[PDB]
Every structure is written in structure tokens, then in C-alpha cells.
Amino acid sequence: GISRDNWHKRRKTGGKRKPYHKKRKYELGRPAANTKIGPRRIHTVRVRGGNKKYRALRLDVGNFSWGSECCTRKTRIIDVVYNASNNELVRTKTLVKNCIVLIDSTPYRQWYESHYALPLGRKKGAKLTPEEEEILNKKRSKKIQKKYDERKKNAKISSLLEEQFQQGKLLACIASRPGQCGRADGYVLEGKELEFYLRKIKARKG
Amino acid sequence: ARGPKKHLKRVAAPKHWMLDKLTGVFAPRPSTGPHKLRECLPLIIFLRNKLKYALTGDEVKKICMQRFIKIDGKVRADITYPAGFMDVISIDKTGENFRLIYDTKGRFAVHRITPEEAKYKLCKVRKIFVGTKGIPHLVTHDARTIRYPDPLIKVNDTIQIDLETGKITDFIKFDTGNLCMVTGGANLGRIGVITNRERHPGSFDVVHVKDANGNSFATRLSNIFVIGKGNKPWISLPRGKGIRLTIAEERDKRLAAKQSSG
């Protein structure tokens, strides 16, 4: 099949190697997962030593970590924006490790709001008619308010994250190989990384 | 090959088994076990060739399949089971106890012990290891794990285990002025007192050892096994006490004993 070995190609000098043995098994090669965005699809692969290796073929959810304040939530992937390796992997919207994807902002917003007693997203003037969010932002007992006021002291999020929350899609980087483990675990882009990537996609925009 | 080998040609077999050339083609490929294949002595070789109870492979099978032999207080009915350095072979019906320890030369001694001494053994620690919930583990030379050791034992110390319970009684710490047997190299079976350890970052640390007659010899730290505090052996030693007198002296002792014998 596909051989993954050194003896098929030229030496440090540029001489041709003559193959002293035919293709071995341990010099193996399987086709690329090229994992897409759809409903969950994973196929199992029996690998060397009789272990298992999961091919994510389609994947829409992943365990992402906004690790500024240590808040990680399982989130719904929507589409891919930028890819450092190749540009056609964004056209044919394939997940690979170190992609840039948009993720559902709602689990992070929910947590931030329920933790800090302030709103996030929620543009100015928009009426909060449901008023179960009212009970999450109001009605505290005596000393719990001492706890939530010494908390919300350092509740200040950065502007470039606020912008994304107001739209409703955060930028995250896939830190787990989706082809190998059958996952899409990542982390939300922040500060210097976020500025660098927003600029790279705007140069791509033109 | 395309997998693990199962045969061992009689010429390619470890030499200290002292196998002849014209008996057969193959030698007993020792079963996998606690000791290494080149540093073991298979139960078949010890039982039939040294003691000469059995005459053939069938007789060794017959002697052991009656559950008679007991290596480290546990019954073994396996002819190619690797019995190695610091083991207590306990044949129950004859009422004998043997301990495998290196003769003055590069071979195993048929060394009979007392049943009071045949209830412990002297294990060297190979690695100290932190468990899954801060549970410290020892791993000894004979592939034997003990968890919750002494918090003092470290990576080149010797421990004394009880043979039924399998737990530490005492330990000899690796430092100067401690009895050590050499268990590898050309100095295989020399008993001496540690003189100096010389650290070599990246390479193998070399340890200088002094014999009982002011004979001094070095060996890399991999091939050392401390068996005593000061000059005190913690087990019984074989006849000679790991000295290795010269071929000139060994000639003199042999023929002088022959002259006096007649």
C-alpha cells in the first residue's frame, strides 16, 4: 500500500538507494481522515499492538476551554475561518489540529453571567422579558452579596472578546488531532493570538 | 525472523551452563520470567546436570510434575523456568535447600543452606517509583514489585524480603565499606568491600572494589550487588568466599592436595 520509510528516496549527497528488501507492514500508511463538519461520524481502526484509533469523519461539537478565568464547556462548531498549513482545507471546510474555527458563545456567556452578576453579549436597549435571567442577576441574601461584589471587582473582560460575544461566535484553535483520537478539543483565542489571527483573516479578506 | 524465537542452539547457549557439544543440537531455551535469559539457570539444567537426580528431559518432567520443586517458596512445575541469582530452590522430599549464587568462577554453585536461612532472600532494588495516589513502589532485580517500602530505600540499595509474605525486613544502603558480590563482567562472582564510587554523567558509573587479600578490581555499577554491612555477609558464602586465587595458586592447591591424598 502506502509505504512510510526513508529507503525509497535519495541520500544526503544525491545518490540513488537500491531497496535491499520489499515493503514491510510496520512501514504502514492509511488515507487522511479529512474530517468534515456534519452530524457525528467516527470509524474505529485496529492499529499496531492491537490498540484502537478513532477516525472522526464528521464532527460538530467539541470540548473547548476559555482558559483566561478557567471556564471550559462542550460547544457546537459552526464553520472553519483560517488554516496556517493549507488554504484549500478552509474551502473544503476540514478540521485539522491548529485550525481556526467559530464556536457557539452561549455556554461561556451563560457561565460568565451566572458567575459575575453582569450581562455579556446582550446589545444596549434590548429588553430582558424572560426574567429568569432577572433571578440570576438579582435576589441575593446578606453576605453572598459581599462575595459577589468582591468577585465582580475583577469581572472586566477585554474589548476583542466582548465584540465576538455581541455577535455570538468565538474564535477557537483545535489542540487535539481530530483524525487520530476522534475529537475536536481546543481553546478560545485571546489577546496577542487573537489580534494576530484577526489581522491574518483580514489580509485574507482584502 | 517475523516474531519472537523459541529455539536456542547448543553452541549459542550461555557458557556457564557448561553444555557439551555432541549431546544434542538445541539447548533448553529458558521460559520468560523474573531473571534475564543469559543470566538465568533453567530448572532442567540445575536438576539433571548439577545434582544428577534426573538422567533425561522425561525424568526432569517426572520429578517436577509431582509438585516437588519450590523456587522462592512457590511451587513451579516448569522445566525451562529461569532460576537466577539469589533464589531458594527448596526440594521438599529429600529435605535439601539450595541457593543459586555465583561460584568464584563465572558459574553457579550447588550451595546447600539450612531451612532457617531458606525462609528469606537478598534482593537489589532497580527503580523507586511513585504510584497512582502517592503509593511508593520498589522494583527489585527479580522483577518483584513491593508497594509502601521504607521511605529511606533508594535506587542501588539491597533489601532482605521474607519469602511467604514478600515484604522488607532489613536493607543495606549502597556506600563505602559494604560487602558487594559482582554479578556481571570478567569479575563474575568476586566478593569484596566497596572502596570508591566514581560518577560519570551520561556514561555508566564505575565502582572500585577491594578483595579480602588486598586484591583490588573495578566493575561498572550495573554489575554490583551489596550482600553485607562492613565485612559481614547477610547469607552463607560458597567454598572460597569469592576470592579467585591465580592459576599458579590453583595449580599448587590442586596437586599439593593430590600429593597429600594418594
Binding site: 482558559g67 483566561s68 496577542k192 493570538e193 | 554523567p201 551520561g202
Partner: protein
């Protein structure tokens, strides 16, 4: 100045987006009595294969050569000269074996003819298996 390529250059060990109210550097001593140099501790480059500030561990052989070429990037060719002993004629013959070697951007100003000590580590590339640990400048070079 750094982060020229598509992907974001950073040290994977440290976290750089801690909520607050200069960047700390990951580095390590590499043993065998080698001094972790100053451009490693203080500097602001990103190198996977820098033996002081990156993911690579020195183990096995430690050799020395003399710098020949420095044309390919973050890598040098050193030239190791020895004598081979033919036994028929009780004489030697002068031989050489030039090998590809990873030079960290730590060792800023290195010229050809410098006596460069290298240490063996995991295969870094097709032909590269060694990494520069120290540099000794050629006899003089004061003026």
C-alpha cells in the same frame, strides 16, 4: 519582529493570557556541566529545537567540529577531521566527515572556523541528529 510564518510562534509550556489587575520565558539547564547562555534566558526568539529553550533532550554522544558553511537557516555544516590507521603500511591517512547540525538563534555571532561542541538528540530532520551546545571562537578574532 518574530512570528513571520502563518501560525502563531509561542512557547507551548507557559500561558501568556493570565487576567491581571513582560512575557516570562521557558528555559532549562541541560546537564553535563554546560552553561545555559544569556540570549536563551533573556532573548525573544521561538525555536522548537533550541536545546535550552525548546522541546529537545540531549542524550548519547557529545562531539566537536569546525564550522564550514552557515547558508541554510537555523542550521550549520561542521567538518570533523580524524586519522584512519591502515595496518599493512604502519601509517595513517587524513579523512573527514562533515555533518548537518542545528544552530540555535541563541548563538548570535558565530563565524566559520569556530570550534563548535555538539550533543546528540532525537532526529530533528532527514540529515540532522546533533545540536550546538557551546561555541569557541577561532584563535584570536579579538581585532
Amino acid at each position: 519582529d518574530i512570528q513571520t510564518e502563518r501560525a502563531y510562534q509561542k512557547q507551548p509550556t507557559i500561558f501568556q493570557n493570565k487576567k491581571r489587575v513582560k512575557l516570562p520565558r521557558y528555559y532549562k539547564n541541560i546537564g553535563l556541566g554546560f552553561k545555559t547562555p544569556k540570549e536563551a534566558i533573556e532573548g525573544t526568539y521561538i525555536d522548537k529545537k533550541c536545546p535550552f529553550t525548546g522541546n529537545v533532550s540531549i542524550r548519547g554522544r557529545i562531539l566537536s567540529g569546525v564550522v564550514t558553511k552557515m547558508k541554510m537557516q537555523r542550521t550549520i555544516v561542521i567538518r570533523r577531521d580524524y586519522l584512519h590507521y591502515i595496518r599493512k603500511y604502519n601509517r595513517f591517512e587524513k579523512r573527514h566527515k562533515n555533518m548537518s547540525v542545528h544552530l540555535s538563534p541563541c548563538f548570535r555571532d558565530v563565524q566559520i572556523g569556530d570550534i563548535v561542541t555538539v550533543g546528540e538528540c532525537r532526529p530533528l530532520s532527514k540529515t540532522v541528529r546533533f545540536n550546538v551546545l557551546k561555541v569557541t571562537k577561532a584563535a584570536g578574532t579579538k581585532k
